[PDB]
Design a protein around this ligand. Structure first.
Ligand SMILES: O=C(O)C(=O)Nc1sc2c(c1C(=O)O)CCNC2
Length: 297
């Protein structure tokens, strides 16, 4: 059981060793496209790059590079795209990828400003009447509506391909109280937000992969995706003891580096999956309890 393991870990105080053990074993694949000179201004952090094998390519002939990867979880049957916070020159490339990849949802786990720095571009419109036009990739993006809770906001955005005039509805789920290099305030408020995303349909396999990002696309995003996948794996089998969280994380780290950036975020994932297991295993009433606990209103 993950729960007995949690207890050993905690008792022996060795979250840091455990986490280091994962970092040591994580895969190392080339990121030669990321490191081409021409892409330097497409990467927010010099030490966070997409592997070549899993990177998302833009369907453009000029330069197909974006800092983004496809995390394809075979067994679980779920994929995600993990990407950094768009830069002021790659917001057009971001929405290009959303369009071409056919995603329905975008999960934003950071604020634009954190720890006194600009962690991400303001890449979506904040009022209905001031849409965004991304001229390099020839897309218009409009705020259609927004559901502001205390700790997250859900926006419906309309993405127009200005060439064909085709239009798509994207949902944006903005978690605003999860600190960089930090954890959510409680398992309940994170699980409540995760289940908002699920219930919206955006993780349905009839859509392209959901796009998940934080500032670097690895720490907060890794934590979110690990919890989601572990819960889905246990759902498929109705067998919580078959799920091995660290092994799930190593498999995700085959497709992007650095997933989960600190030992406490690893700790947090166990908490989130252990609590989430209650819902998976047939008490849906816990979902209402999460909602109340997270004071969403
Ligand atoms: O946004 C996150 O959750 C995350 O992984 N952020 C990261 S991972 C990372 C950095 C940051 C950052 O935001 O400064 C700075 C460069 N080193 C690795």
């Amino acid at each position: 059981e993950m729960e007995k393991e949690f207890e050993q870990i905690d008792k022996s105080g060795s979250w840091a060793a455990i986490y280091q053990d994962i970092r040591h074993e994580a895969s190392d694949f080339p990121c030669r496209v990321a490191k081409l000179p021409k892409n330097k201004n497409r990467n927010r952090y010099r030490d966070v790059s997409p592997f070549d094998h899993s990177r998302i390519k833009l369907h453009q002939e000029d330069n197909d590079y974006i800092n983004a990867s496809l995390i394809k979880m075979e067994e679980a049957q779920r994929s995600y795209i993990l990407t950094q916070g768009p830069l002021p020159n790659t917001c057009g490339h971001f929405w290009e990828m959303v369009w071409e990849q056919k995603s329905r949802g975008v999960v934003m786990l950071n604020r634009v400003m954190e720890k006194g720095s600009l962690k991400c571009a303001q890449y979506w419109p904040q009022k209905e009447e001031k849409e965004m036009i991304f001229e390099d990739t020839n897309l218009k993006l409009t705020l259609i509506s927004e559901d502001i809770k205390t700790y997250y906001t859900v926006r419906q955005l309309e993405l127009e391909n200005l060439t064909t005039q085709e239009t798509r509805e994207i949902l944006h789920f903005h978690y605003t109280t999860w600190p960089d290099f930090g954890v959510p305030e409680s398992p309940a408020s994170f699980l409540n937000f995760l289940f908002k995303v699920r219930e919206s349909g955006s993780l349905s396999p009839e859509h392209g992969p959901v796009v998940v990002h934080c500032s670097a696309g690895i720490g907060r995003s890794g934590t979110f995706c690990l919890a989601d996948t572990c819960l889905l794996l246990m759902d498929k089998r109705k067998d919580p003891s078959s799920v091995d969280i660290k092994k799930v994380l190593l498999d995700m780290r085959k497709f992007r580096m650095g997933l989960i950036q600190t030992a406490d975020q690893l700790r947090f994932s166990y908490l989130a999956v252990i609590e989430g297991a209650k819902f998976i295993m047939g008490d849906s009433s816990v979902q209402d309890q999460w909602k109340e606990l997270s004071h969403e209103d």
